[PDB]
Design a protein around this ligand. Sequence first.
Ligand SMILES: [Mg+2]
Ligand SMILES: [Mg+2]
Ligand SMILES: [Mg+2]
Ligand SMILES: [Mg+2]
Ligand SMILES: [Mg+2]
Ligand SMILES: [Mg+2]
Ligand SMILES: [Mg+2]
Ligand SMILES: [Mg+2]
Ligand SMILES: [Mg+2]
Ligand SMILES: [Mg+2]
Ligand SMILES: [Mg+2]
Ligand SMILES: [Mg+2]
Ligand SMILES: [Mg+2]
Ligand SMILES: [Mg+2]
Ligand SMILES: [Mg+2]
Ligand SMILES: [Mg+2]
Ligand SMILES: [Mg+2]
Ligand SMILES: [Mg+2]
Ligand SMILES: [Mg+2]
Ligand SMILES: [Zn+2]
Lengths: 134, 44, 150, 79, 129
Amino acid sequence: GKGKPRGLNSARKLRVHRRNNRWAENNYKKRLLGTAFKSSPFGGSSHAKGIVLEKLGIESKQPNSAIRKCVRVQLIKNGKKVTAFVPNDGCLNFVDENDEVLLAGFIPGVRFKVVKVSGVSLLALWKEKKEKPR
Amino acid sequence: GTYRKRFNEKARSGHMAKLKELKRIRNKQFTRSKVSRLKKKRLD
Amino acid sequence: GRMHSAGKGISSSAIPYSRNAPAWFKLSSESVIEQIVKYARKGLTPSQIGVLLRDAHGVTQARVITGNKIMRILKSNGLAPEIPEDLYYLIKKAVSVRKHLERNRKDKDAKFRLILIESRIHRLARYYRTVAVLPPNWKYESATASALVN
Amino acid sequence: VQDLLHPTAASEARKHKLKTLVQGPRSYFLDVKCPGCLNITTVFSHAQTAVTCESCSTILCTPTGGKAKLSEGTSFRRK
Amino acid sequence: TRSSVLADALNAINNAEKTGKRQVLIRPSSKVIIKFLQVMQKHGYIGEFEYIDDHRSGKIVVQLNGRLNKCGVISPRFNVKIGDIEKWTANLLPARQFGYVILTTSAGIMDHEEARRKHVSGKILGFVY
RNA sequence: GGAUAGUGGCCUACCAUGGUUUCAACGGGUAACGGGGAAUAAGGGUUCGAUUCCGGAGAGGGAGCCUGAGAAACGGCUACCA
RNA sequence: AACGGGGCCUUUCCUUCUGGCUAACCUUGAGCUCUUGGCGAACCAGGACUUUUACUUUGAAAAAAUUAGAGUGUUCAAAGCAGGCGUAUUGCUCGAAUAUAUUAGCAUGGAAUAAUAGAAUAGGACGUUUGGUUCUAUUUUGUUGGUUUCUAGGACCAUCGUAAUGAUUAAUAGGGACGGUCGGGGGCAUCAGUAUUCAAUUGUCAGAGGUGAAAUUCUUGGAUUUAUUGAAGACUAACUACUGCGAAAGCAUUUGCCAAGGACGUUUUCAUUAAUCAAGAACGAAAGUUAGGGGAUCGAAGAUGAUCAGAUACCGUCGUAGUCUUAACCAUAAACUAUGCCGACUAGGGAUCGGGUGGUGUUUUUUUAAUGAC
RNA sequence: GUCGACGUACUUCAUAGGAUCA
Ligand SMILES: [Mg+2]
Ligand SMILES: [Mg+2]
Ligand SMILES: [Mg+2]
Ligand SMILES: [Mg+2]
Ligand SMILES: [Mg+2]
Ligand SMILES: [Mg+2]
Ligand SMILES: [Mg+2]
Ligand SMILES: [Mg+2]
Ligand SMILES: [Mg+2]
Ligand SMILES: [Mg+2]
Ligand SMILES: [Mg+2]
Ligand SMILES: [Mg+2]
Ligand SMILES: [Mg+2]
Ligand SMILES: [Mg+2]
Ligand SMILES: [Mg+2]
Ligand SMILES: [Mg+2]
Ligand SMILES: [Mg+2]
Ligand SMILES: [Mg+2]
Ligand SMILES: [Mg+2]
Ligand SMILES: [Zn+2]
């Protein structure tokens, strides 16, 4: 015996035993209880809006440094402050204080990158195909 | 689904009434904000 | 093998292959039956009758000699225990244990053995009720079990 | 090497009663002659009862752990 | 307590084959055991076998020729439809034509190829290969 | 007995004390209309199905009706709630 | 020659009634075929009669669309169910297939596997036995109604006869009984052993105690040590061994009482009564709580001497609760083989514990012997 | 109140072994 019922009329015990045990999985528990988005960086969203507080690396001497591309952003949904990357210092000119920025998942500790500023794509601005509306 | 929060409960008051009645019959066997609750506890 | 224990003993009686009476046995099949009835009238249980016949009369097995089991021979002749023999002895043992417990309330060991004996009565009493040997409303109740064993 | 279908007689004799090819009793019955009345009584080899001669009421055997011990002075034959 | 005597018989045969014994003792006997052994005998996996009567369930002595790779019982005896036989042959046998899956069908106990030829089906008793 | 197109505690009067449940009743949750179907998978399985067809229910929320073969209708009526 | 499917025979046919047709069999006659007249099997239809399922085979059912899939030059294809062939003229013609679909319900062939019921106070089966007490009622009663007769049928009660008259093993499953044992298994009484502490008496006289050295401590009112006693409360050394017993925790002085138990022996008895187990219950080391008793030793807590020296570095003295017990709570352990329970099988060896069998073995019984021990 | 316990979500530390050669 393998420690499980094997009789032909033991379907109920096998079903009930299985149902009780599926709750041991973390994947199952999160999936059913709807808590799988607590771990998500944006709390269930794929993108987040934020307010540019300050450009921390604006003053760093070495051009195009990793620090130069970081911007300190305040998440509008909950007000928590986070750090986000910019593709390059050339794009950092477009970003300035007090604009709405759409963040996306990505110096360790920086997990976000800016994809839109003032409702316009940075890549569109970087390629000189749009103007930032103010 | 029976007693879930509705967008505008006031606009369907009669509906809410039914639910209450149902509860009173269904749960008859048993009967026979964070800040507010914490404030009461600390006051006590 | 033992229920209510860890023992696995196999001591048992081995019935011979041949199902006919021994050649050296030269007593009529009838005459054995009166012997069974006479002992049953004397009060002996079926187990005790078989020991006497086998030990002192050469009756190897009542079924072989007479074609019917001892209990059936007794019932045919109007001799029938009110309750089956084995159930009678289990109740008798439990009554003796209870009489020991009332004087000795700290005898936790006897308290444990009483549960095993009673749980043995209920399993056996449950069997007889199914076959209808025992009336369906028959229960082993602790208080009045002394009456049944008498 | 041995043949299970046709075991040796000594081999079977050594084995336990229930473990032979076809289980059977290792006991037997005896004709015991009372010293007084010279009548014959049938006694089981492993008798559990103090068999008594019916005419003389004399003890013929006494029970023990296994085989019964026959009373001294009682002649016996295997039946 | 003894639940499946056929399981005990098949296990004893497998152990005896493993140890290289030329013959094995099976106790208790049964009609199902005898029919299973007769199927194996027809397919050659075992030799002559002899039933010993002792006024009880009985005994058997089986001659072994060393041609048996494995014999086993499938417990519980699942109800097998004609479509479901091939699944069982795939699951239990190392190859397609290496071995047999024995079924107790309404026409008797038989190997799966005989079942397909006779267009019958039933419960599954075990396998031999 | 009443009522219904009609069976029926559907309701009434009088009677009994019954009925369901560890083979999970009852209560709770459901980001629960159900199915045909969709995806994946070697097979067992797991998940999805408001959404071209079928059936059910609703016409802001409760309640009650006229007409008519057919509606408790709402691109019909009356009251109450918002 | 292998594979499958049907029939018979072999002690093996469902029973009964009615109806329909009629084979074959006997026979006349005319040529294996027709024909006269009997007999009417088989088969079919219906009424009574009737153990119930599980399982599997086959057939219907499971909308269309969707999926798979046959045909077709939508210019190809995704698709769609279209289309194709002649043509001066009137026209001809192939398709719109097929499979799948779980469970439940229905019909059907199997009869392996697994259940279920039957004859035991016979209240049993059968009948061309024989009698009753009942109910029903076709036709003939011209017709209707009522009664009666005969008759038929159903049920019931007796009677007679027929019959192989009716009960599967007894699992190296389980329970029960019996016999002689076995155990540091359990409860209640009882007996003893020194030892520890204390007290009395007793002889002696400077230390005793503890440290790495000291000091708190006791001490000429006699300490420590010595001898004769006495009291109290615990615990059972050596024998003592992973050996024995118990479900586990656990169990060690003698004797008695009470009940319980494994194994062994049995040609005794019952006959599947069994394995595992949510719910529920009994016990559960040590510590611990409630209320009495006891309180020798050791001793959490508390106090106090010294706080110098690293192998002897946490030591000393007093010691509350506890340790013990009675009546109840608590329910935890490395509660360990860090290893579920039941059953089967797969090597040799010699040691040990309990029982049993065998020996013409040693010893004892010192009369034999029989026991006991080897 | 840089409070305790729990639940949840994360971060981090433990990877080299044999043979030849210099
Ligand atoms: Mg196994
Ligand atoms: Mg026994
Ligand atoms: Mg009423
Ligand atoms: Mg859904
Ligand atoms: Mg909904
Ligand atoms: Mg839908
Ligand atoms: Mg509507
Ligand atoms: Mg609206
Ligand atoms: Mg309306
Ligand atoms: Mg509208
Ligand atoms: Mg409308
Ligand atoms: Mg079906
Ligand atoms: Mg037996
Ligand atoms: Mg011992
Ligand atoms: Mg016993
Ligand atoms: Mg308790
Ligand atoms: Mg106290
Ligand atoms: Mg322990
Ligand atoms: Mg085992
Ligand atoms: Zn005599």
